[PDB]
Design a protein around this nucleic acid. Structure first.
Ligand SMILES: OC[C@H]1O[C@H](O[C@H]2[C@H](O)[C@@H](O)[C@@H](O)O[C@@H]2CO)[C@H](O)[C@@H](O)[C@@H]1O
Ligand SMILES: OC[C@H]1O[C@H](O[C@H]2[C@H](O)[C@@H](O)[C@@H](O)O[C@@H]2CO)[C@H](O)[C@@H](O)[C@@H]1O
Lengths: 436, 437
DNA sequence: TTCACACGTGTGAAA
DNA sequence: TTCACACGTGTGAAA
């Protein structure tokens, strides 16, 4: 739990938390405030469960798509940087972190998936998804594979699902229609069927996850992977000469990745809200601060204009933003969580053969729509059934006490009910068949 | 995933040397042409029993021996059939660790015991007792450091202190463990966990500290001590910290008693590669060169293979490891061990957080660790009984609604039908169900 | 050991 | 939207 004078940060384990820990240390030396960085598992899920009761970190790092629900549940302290600060960042990165007219976190970096390839195994990477199967057949004869990427998180498969028409929630009339979903249309089916066919034809394995794909590419066992800017440092430490380029087209259309804006929201329950902005505004979001983090694990197109003009000249960043322009920024609405869980279930269930593509995406469409019942709705149901059981229990208590039925020493209420039935002129068979 | 004929898939925990093991796999593929894939998924010791029940899961699974008895009872492991010649190459007691109902159910790899790891430059003379840690931490804090940080989310790391003054898991008597004789709630266990919660109350430790927080703190020089196993040394070596490995401190003048694990490799019962897995484990991994490749990635501890252990035993860090092991006990491998671990993990976490008193947390742990897990058939019995109870009721009300003519509204629940029936039989029923003649 | 009612949420109505 | 019986397991009685 939070406490005054200290700063605890939650950031995903694939970002440069060590580099950010070097930001907190210099922050500690200036004003004497200790700064701990922790990279817990499923931090995007734990934070909403714990922040309600007042627990959780001072600052939470995650992509912007989750912050709308967080704010909707009143977990985030509203951000109000001076004008002088707001102008230090690109406008569209402020838009990613504004929900109902209010800024709900500090945008940090823009992330988009790209195609990463091994130049030594594949000097000329494919321009199309359609030619990957043949390429894998050629590489399988050399003991390699064409492509491996995380199939457990729909983030990585969404570029292909959206290529031919799939979409999450249609945007029209300046709003996201929380009830117009595009996970079941012809384009989505085409994209997921091709992915499943890749598995069926043994060009990919349904159980490949982030760790398995990263190891295979960094050990030179697979020619390509799909990943974000954070993955680059680990490829750098390996012996692989890699390139970063546009994702392959599918049916002649670009892959359309969902673009995220890594952000840092301040816990509404924190006693260090001011201390946290002094850290975020004048220590992290500075050339030397982003540098220390970026040097750990690349951030992507950092939102600070001041440092992005430097990073923007990296050909890997140019490629990252080439993919981003062909994709879309993620909505931040609270229903993204339901959308992501549903599509995750669809991809996994179709990849494994547990469901057909048609059945998986059909269910996904209705799941990404589902309303989650409120606490009060759950409590209404709990109480109604408590009252139903209490009413029955009182009836049978009086029947047992006053009925003087010929009942066994121990018997259930069904037997009492039977004795009440015969008294009222009914016949009740062994199995409950009841008539006059 | 299913395991395919002609390929080998291995599961091993992420803190072990899976990169070294993958190199052994790459040699095996070079000599016989069989591809070997090594993965380190999360919660593998829980995932395996779920998938392997239907023939899924890996060909080979690595874990400490304590979980394998439950696997074998569930029929998930092949029986290990090493010729006597090969058995003689490993220490007898390591075979004991993987013997269950008289059969060998895994290949023992290495013996693991927790030790005290300390920063020589911050603390040239490590403490001999737990009792002096609070004072030592008070010194270190004045310099911006802490005395001790270790994993408080896995009971494995706190058990040495719980066991020190008398806590125990299952009592051994007459050549077997008594699954109803649990010792997580006696005076010694209470004293050990109380001292740990007292560390937390006096701000000498954080209740939320997990494995990665403690490892980062020690390896960065923020804390003078940690508690960990041999797997952790390689990350320390790469750090600036100059460390030593020594005996765990005493508690109430008595040695800490870590539970000792034997890293073991089981063969999935559903694998058609049982012969290939046996070949790989016997003739590639459990060799000098095989264990060396893994050990160089992350230290294994005291390996079961006599020939290579005579080399590793020269290491003072292994001598210390086995000094702690002698003071501890080999874990049981009985199926009830997972229930014991879940119970103590909840007790430690709840007490460390103040959610429960020590007495309450451990009282619940004792009941949970001793609770008999109902069989599948007992569960099915209960499920069918309640299915039948509802069915009889349903038929009774179906008949009452059909032939009753109780003048009831379009839709109404069974309680209202019951009420009508009661008045038909000469009863009065109030709104809340109060019923009488 | 078996057993019965409690328990809160699921599924599907009915509006 | 509210509502009701289904659902399998929990708590604890009787033996
Ligand atoms: O897979 C669904 C997942 O997608 C995104 O998560 C990304 C994250 O944005 C990246 O920074 C990186 O960590 O990879 C993640 C995918 O594993 C969404 O941000 C997230 O809400 C969603 O659950
Ligand atoms: O914490 C309970 C846990 O303890 C042991 O797990 C150890 C394992 O033996 C070591 O090899 C290492 O990985 O640390 C683990 C604890 O995080 C038991 O083996 C395990 O069954 C039990 O759940």
């Amino acid at each position: 739990k939070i406490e005054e004078g200290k700063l605890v940060i939650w950031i995903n384990g694939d970002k440069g938390y060590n580099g950010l820990a070097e930001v907190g240390k210099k922050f500690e030396k200036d004003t004497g405030i200790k700064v701990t960085v922790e990279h817990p598992d499923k931090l995007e899920e734990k934070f909403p469960q714990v922040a309600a009761t007042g627990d959780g970190p001072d600052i939470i790092f995650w992509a912007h798509d989750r912050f709308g629900g967080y704010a909707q549940s009143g977990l985030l302290a509203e951000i109000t940087p001076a004008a002088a600060f707001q102008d230090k960042l690109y406008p569209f990165t402020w838009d990613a972190v504004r929900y109902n007219g209010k800024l709900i976190a500090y945008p940090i970096a823009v992330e988009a998936l790209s195609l990463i390839y091994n130049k030594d195994l594949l000097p000329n990477p494919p321009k199309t998804w359609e030619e990957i199967p043949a390429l894998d057949k050629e590489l399988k004869a050399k003991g390699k594979s064409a492509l491996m990427f995380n199939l457990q998180e729909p983030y990585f498969t969404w570029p292909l699902i959206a290529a031919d028409g799939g979409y999450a929630f249609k945007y029209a009339a300046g709003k996201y229609d929380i009830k117009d979903v595009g996970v079941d249309n012809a384009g989505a089916k085409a994209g997921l069927t091709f992915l499943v066919d890749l598995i069926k034809n043994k060009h990919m394995n349904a159980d490949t996850d982030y760790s398995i794909a990263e190891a295979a590419f960094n050990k030179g066992e697979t020619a390509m992977t799909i990943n974000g800017p954070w993955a680059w440092s680990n490829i750098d430490t390996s012996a692989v000469n890699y390139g970063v380029t546009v994702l392959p087209t599918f049916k002649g259309q670009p892959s359309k990745p969902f673009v995220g804006v890594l952000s840092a929201g301040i816990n509404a329950a924190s006693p260090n809200k001011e201390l946290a902005k002094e850290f975020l505004e004048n220590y992290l979001l500075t050339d030397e601060g982003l540098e220390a983090v970026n040097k750990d694990k690349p951030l992507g197109a950092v939102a600070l204009k001041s440092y992005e003009e430097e990073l923007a000249k990296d050909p890997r960043i140019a490629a990252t933003m080439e993919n981003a322009q062909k994709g879309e920024i993620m909505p931040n609405i609270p229903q993204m969580s339901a959308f992501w869980y549903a599509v995750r279930t669809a991809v996994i269930n179709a990849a494994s053969g547990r469901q057909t593509v048609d059945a998986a995406l059909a269910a996904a469409q209705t799941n990404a729509a589902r309303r989650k019942p409120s606490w009060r709705e759950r409590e209404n149901n709990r109480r109604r059934e408590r009252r139903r059981r209490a009413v029955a229990a009182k009836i049978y208590t009086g029947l047992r006490a006053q009925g003087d039925y010929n009942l066994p020493k121990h018997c259930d209420n069904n037997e009492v009910l039977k004795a009440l039935c015969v008294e009222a002129g009914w016949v009740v068979e062994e199995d409950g068949t009841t008539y006059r």
